[PDB]
Paper text:
TRPM2 belongs to the M (Melastatin) subfamily of transient receptor potential (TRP) ion channels. TRPM2 is a Ca2+ permeable non-selective cation channel opened by simultaneous binding of three obligate co-activators, cytosolic ADP-ribose (ADPR), Ca2+, and membrane phosphatidylinositol 4,5-bisphosphate (PIP2). Similarly to other TRPM subfamily channels, homotetrameric TRPM2 channels contain an ~800 residue N-terminal region, a transmembrane domain (TMD), a TRP domain, and a coiled-coil. In TRPM2 a C-terminal ~270 residue NUDT9-homology (NUDT9H) domain serves to bind ADPR.
Here, we determined the structure of the TRPM2 channel from the cnidarian Nematostella vectensis (nvTRPM2) in complex with Ca2+ by electron cryo-microscopy (cryo-EM), at a resolution of 3.1 Å, and correlated the structure with detailed biophysical characterization of channel permeation and gating properties. The C-terminal NUDT9H domain, however, is entirely invisible in the density map, indicating that in the absence of ADPR this domain is flexibly linked to the core structure. The selectivity filter is short and wide, the diameter at its narrowest point is ~5.2 Å, larger than that of TRPM4 (~4.2 Å). The external vestibule of nvTRPM2 is lined by a double ring of negative charges, the side chains of D1041 and E1042 of the post-filter helix (LDE motif, inset), and additional negatively charged side chains (E1046 and E1050) line the upper parts of the vestibule. As observed in other TRPM family channels, the gate of nvTRPM2 is formed by the S6 bundle crossing which constricts the pore to a diameter of less than 2 Å between residues I1082 and N1086. Because that diameter is too small to allow passage of a water molecule, the observed nvTRPM2 conformation must correspond to a closed gate, as expected in the absence of ADPR. Although the nvTRPM2 structure was obtained in the presence of trace amounts of Ca2+ (free Ca2+ concentration in an unbuffered saline with no added Ca2+ is in the micromolar range, for example, [Csanády and Adam-Vizi, 2003]), clear density for a bound Ca2+ ion is seen, occluded into each subunit. The Ca2+ binding site, formed by the cytosolic ends of transmembrane helices S2 and S3, and the S2-S3 linker helix, is located at the membrane-cytosol interface, and is accessible from the protein surface through a narrow opening (‘peripheral tunnel’). The bound Ca2+ ion is coordinated by the side chains of residues E893 and Q896 of S2 and N918 and D921 of S3 in a pentacovalent geometry, E893 provides two coordinate bonds to the ion.
Residue numbers in the entry:
A (entry chain A): 469 to 546, 573 to 755, 812 to 1136, 1148 to 1170
B (entry chain B): 937 to 1092
C (entry chain D): 703 to 755
């Protein structure tokens, strides 16, 4: 096939619709696509294979509202030739799991990088489909290995594109591709979880440029912080992308002399200029300015919530005005309501268009559990607050005073934008497994020693028997646990402290230190030192991978803050309304010209060669 | 100037400046073949210590505010009526509890005169929150800091 | 496979725990080796059919 192509076969003339339908009609039988095609044409009762069936199978193998061109384009229903012969024969090759034929057809193609990323998506998704289904044969490791090969090819083409020209390669990553359902290469590289592609320098520099949305590259945090609240300083001290590009072009025109005698992506990647009012809205629309705003608003919330919890949270009495409620607590209700709205619109703006699928992908990351938990816990506390009864009021204030933990621990996501703290916070969650295993083994020793200790000190009936069930159950767990950290109860477990600890049995007075001594050998100088050894072992292995995981998560970070409301933390809820007005009325990419799209295809193809 | 307040300021300032004049000795110790490289290794480990303290400070303050809120209710009978001791106690007691100074008599019912009388429901919440804090501080973060130093020691 | 002696490969602990004390639930919810092998063979006989007609 390679030899026929490079001698005298032209796929524009060769491939008609009937040949393509004949190619899909004669799939082997031992492949993964054959059950999928049979199941698709099994429903809706169609006896002959056509491209609508193949389109729908390709659509369900790429779940994020993908739209295959077979379902819409007029050339694939039932002479002028087909629009993309190399692409759809390449798609047939990768769906049949033919390695060499797919490679041959990949090398003779228009978009190598996008095709490679789509291939890897298709392969690993049908691999997982083959794995989890009983009526499809498990060839999953073969499909994952083939997906990995296409991932390497995509990175290789990007690397060569980066080495030739660093700027236009970043433009290459944000091209609105027409043959891949208006989806860009960066989104394709996120759909298939390709960490090696996103971790590459070109993508990382692009993400930093998108983070600095229509704003100079070396604008520091404090300069943004000042200009966020004083919008009269927005024009003099903040530089922009047109200004630095004008300076570079004006310089480079002089170097050639002889020595003697919603349009943010456009203004980033074009020679567009900003007036006065444009570069105010463009400053507020930048992700980094929204982030700085979020941080200031979040600090205000924590101090406000810490004040009400520590100093002033009285009980509800109908006699006093407003129920004797300080305005602080009403401002707290306002901000928590703002966070609730933020989480609602984070749920609503997910890639799938099914409420179950939105919810399923919304609970993929573990922060959203903590978000919805802390918000639910807060609403329950404020519902319980108003009833004027000491028991449930005590329940209300305790629930708030424990919810402070979750709202403060939630700060670690805004700390994870840092280059150094980010990877460390990934390393911690990877060490939680070893901590869990340690605690299980420790719990077995703790409970063994605990039951023995309490049984020996306090006999079961008698004079020294403590006549209370709950304190017995809690003491078994309690005293062994504190004895780990050097709180040895040597006066207590021996004869002394009859009033505080309770009087011990005469034979318990000498058993207790002996059992303690043995417990202290097997706990402090064996298990704890073994835990140190386990962490040092796993730290190097996790060090290699946790950086890539942080690199990959920067896309979600940028995409999150790209979609956040425009206005600042104090008025952020007012800003939120404008999204509601836009929604009731009824993005990181650029549309190129046909001439430019042709030029970019030619340059990408030469880089692949 | 002959005034007790600013004289107290004078002697305190001298008695703290002794630290900097003694710590300045480490430059004359760094002419040695063996001690010199070690003193360079220390300043390269200060970055990892700084990152550790930031993460530790987040856990410390979370636990601190929760602990103090639960023990001493905001208005009422058990509310300590003093702003500065509240602000300093939130930071103080969680910090000493890292190094094995567990205030188990104090955070429970006992020591009403020294520590202050605790709320009846704080008497049983405080050890439970302490127990959780001691897992996530002593047997997770401190052991992780040991792992970080051993990793970076070879490279440095 | 010997550990899963004459019982489906993906039968979880709790399903066994329920069926151990309630032996009336033993038939409906516990799958077995013949059932999964019959399913695989019945599928693989169908995969050999032609895609058209
Ligand atoms: C009144 C006070 C207002 C203070 C506002 C601080 C503004 C933060 C933004 C910032 O500084 O950006 C920093 C980014 O790196 C980080 O953001 C890493 C995380 C640190 C920020 C959080 C600090 C603690 C406040 C939250 C605590 C929560 C409560 C915790 C309660 C326990 C630095 O950015 P830059 O280097 O200058 O950018 C230029 C280069 N670049 C664009 C190429 C990258
Ligand atoms: C050191 C590291 C800090 C770590 C954070 C420590 C956590 C605490 C900091 C965070 C919460 C902020 C609490 C302080 C603000 C409230 C002041 C106040 O109580 O008002 C008082 C006056 O005003 C005093 O100046 C009056 O008090 P009131 O009568 O009750 O009204
Ligand atoms: C009484 C009840 C109180 C219980 C309080 C316990 C509260 C438990 C809070 C659980 C949330 C932590 C996981 C966050 C997460 O989503 O994972 C992220 C990583 O997260 C990290 O960066 C490391 C997290 C370590 C925090 C360990 C718990 C802090 C306890 C503080 C101890 C203070 C003492 C408390 C007393 C990544 O998620 P993803 O990759 O995006 O998917
Ligand atoms: C996270 C910890 C849960 C936070 C939930 C917080 C919500 C709590 C709501 C219920 C509060 C009722 C208080 C009460 O009635 O006090 C009575 C006296 O109480 C005692 O003297 C102690 C008796 C044991 C308490 C229950 C077991 C505690 C340990 C196990 C608790 C698990 C009167
Ligand atoms: C209870 C609450 C207590 C109050 C706490 C409030 C504290 C207020 C804090 C205010 C100060 C905020 C400073 C943030 C800037 C950090 C330095 C920096 O620029 O990051 C640089 C790194 O730097 C390290 O090398 C670059 O980081 P990057 O670009 O992200 O990579
Ligand atoms: C509080 C009490 C302290 C004990 C309880 C708290 C300690 C943490 C609980 C961990 C839950 C299980 C778990 O996550 O699996 C973990 C591994 O461990 C296993 O897979 C072993 C499975 C047995 C779990 C039952 C332990 C009984 C604890 C009672 C022991 C006998 C008494 C890790 O999961 P991962 O997916 O690999 O990441
Ligand atoms: C490094 C530490 C700074 C050394 C500076 C050293 C120079 C100090 C010069 C001022 C000394 C004034 C002493 C005084 O007037 O005592 C009065 C009573 O003081 C008290 O009872 C305590 C009140 C709190 C003190 C201020 C906060 C201390 C913690 C935060 C301090 C930060 C009377
Ligand atoms: C508060 C104050 C308390 C009093 C403290 C006063 C203590 C007075 C101390 C007085 C004794 C000083 C001895 C210095 C000589 C060290 C040994 C030596 O020769 O160095 C050799 C190394 O040696 C190691 O291997 C060579 O070192 P190099 O050539 O540099 O390489
Ligand atoms: C005393 C209180 C204890 C906390 C304060 C003392 C702890 C040391 C302070 C370190 C200052 C920042 C710094 O040096 O960067 C360091 C990295 O860390 C970062 O780059 C994160 C940037 C956020 C810094 C603000 C932390 C707020 C602490 C409050 C946390 C929330 C409460 C290292 O810098 P380097 O250049 O890489 O070397
Ligand atoms: C009322 C309560 C009844 C609870 C019954 C638990 C049933 C245990 C069996 C079980 O879950 O199997 C687990 C196996 O892995 C293990 O068994 C590892 C050890 C954990 C089990 C012991 C838990 C602690 C109870 C004992 C403490 C002793 C007293 C300690 C006193 C200090 C999970 O099996 P599976 O994954 O679902 O299997 C499917 C996949 N597979 C077949 C391919 C493998
Ligand atoms: C727990 O209850 C037991 C049984 O009522 C008590 O044991 C008795 O104590 C009295 C007074 O010291 C003795 O005269 C009896 O001989 C004991 N009974 C038996 C069967 O030996 C015990 O005092 C109670 N303990 C506490 C701490 O309250
Ligand atoms: C802190 O101040 C509060 C308010 O003045 C005091 O609470 C009152 O204490 C008295 C005497 O025990 C009671 O009769 C009142 O019912 C309490 N007031 C309320 C509103 O409940 C409290 O005693 C002070 N605490 C300290 C430690 O000084
Ligand atoms: C570290 C090596 C040498 C093991 C030491 C074990 C020691 C600490 C253990 C083993 C036997 C124990 C002793 C057994 C008998 C007595 C007599 C009386 O006074 C009560 C405690 C006391 C004194 C115990 C103290 C702790 C003890 C001495
Ligand atoms: C190490 C493993 C087993 C976890 C142990 C957790 C223990 C130490 C925690 C969890 C629940 C806590 C108990 C909760 C209730 C009580 C009743 C009363 O007496 C106050 C403290 C006391 C007794 C607490 C002591 C500490 C405690 C027992
Ligand atoms: Ca969220």
């Amino acid at each position: 096939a390679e030899l026929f192509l490079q001698n005298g076969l032209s796929m524009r003339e060769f491939l008609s619709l009937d040949i393509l339908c004949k190619l899909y009609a004669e799939v082997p039988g031992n492949t993964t696509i054959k059950p999928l095609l049979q199941k698709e044409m099994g429903k809706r009762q169609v006896k002959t294979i056509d491209m609508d069936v193949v389109g729908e199978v390709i659509e369900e193998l790429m779940g994020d509202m993908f739209e295959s061109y077979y379902r819409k384009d007029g050339h694939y229903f039932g002479i002028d030739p087909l629009p993309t012969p190399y692409l759809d024969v390449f798609l047939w090759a990768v769906l049949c799991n033919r390695r060499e034929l797919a490679r041959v057809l990949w090398e003779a193609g228009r978009e190598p990088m996008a095709a490679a990323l789509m291939a890897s998506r298709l392969l690993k998704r049908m691999a997982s489909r083959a794995q989890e289904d009983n009526t499809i044969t498990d060839i999953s490791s073969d499909l994952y290995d083939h997906a990995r090969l296409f991932e390497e090819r995509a990175v290789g083409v990007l690397d060569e594109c980066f080495n030739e020209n660093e700027t236009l390669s970043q433009t290459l990553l944000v091209r609105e591709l027409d043959h891949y359902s208006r989806m860009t290469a960066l989104e394709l590289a996120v759909s298939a979880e390709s960490q090696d592609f996103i971790a590459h320098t070109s993508c990382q520099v692009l993400l930093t440029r998108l983070w600095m949305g229509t704003m100079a590259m070396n604008t520091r945090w404090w300069k943004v912080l000042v200009c966020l609240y004083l919008p009269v300083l927005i024009f003099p001290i903040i530089y922009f992308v047109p200004d630095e590009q004008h300076e570079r072009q004006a310089a480079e025109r002089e170097h050639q002399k002889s020595l003697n005698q919603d349009d943010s992506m456009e203004v980033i990647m074009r020679n567009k200029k900003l007036g006065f009012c444009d570069r105010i809205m463009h400053f507020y629309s930048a992700p980094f300015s929204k982030f700085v705003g979020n941080v200031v608003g979040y600090l205000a919330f924590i101090f406000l919530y810490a004040y009400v919890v520590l100093f002033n949270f009285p009980r509800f009495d109908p006699a006093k005005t407003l129920g004797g409620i300080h305005p602080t607590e009403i401002v707290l209700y306002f901000w928590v309501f703002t966070i609730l709205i933020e989480e609602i619109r984070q749920l609503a703006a997910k890639p799938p268009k099914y409420i179950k699928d939105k919810v399923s992908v919304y609970f993929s990351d573990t922060w959203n559990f903590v978000d919805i938990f802390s918000l639910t816990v807060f609403i329950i506390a404020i519902i319980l607050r108003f009833f004027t009864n000491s028991r449930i009021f005590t329940a209300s204030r305790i629930i708030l005073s424990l919810d402070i933990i979750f709202f403060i621990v939630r700060s670690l996501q805004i700390f994870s934008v840092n280059r150094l703290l980010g990877p460390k916070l990934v390393m911690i969650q990877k060490m939680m497994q070893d901590l869990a295993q340690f605690i299980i083994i420790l719990a077995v020793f703790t409970i063994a020693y605990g039951i023995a200790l309490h049984a020996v000190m306090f006999p079961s009936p008698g004079i020294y028997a403590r006549n209370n069930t709950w304190v017995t159950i809690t003491s078994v767990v309690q005293y062994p646990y504190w004895q780990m950290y050097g709180e040895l109860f040597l006066d207590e477990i021996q004869g002394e402290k009859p009033k505080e600890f309770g009087e011990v049995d005469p034979d318990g007075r000498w058993l207790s230190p002996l059992l303690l001594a043995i417990y202290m050998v097997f706990t402090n100088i064996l298990l704890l030192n073994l835990l140190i050894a386990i962490f040092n072992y796993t730290f190097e292995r996790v060090q290699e991978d946790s950086d890539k995981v942080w690199k990959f998560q920067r896309y979600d970070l940028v995409q999150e803050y790209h979609s956040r409301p425009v206005f600042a933390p104090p008025l952020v809820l007012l800003g939120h309304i404008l999204i509601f007005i836009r929604w009731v009325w009824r993005t990181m990419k650029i549309g190129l010209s046909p001439a430019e799209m042709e030029q970019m295809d030619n340059w990408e193809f030469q880089a692949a060669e």
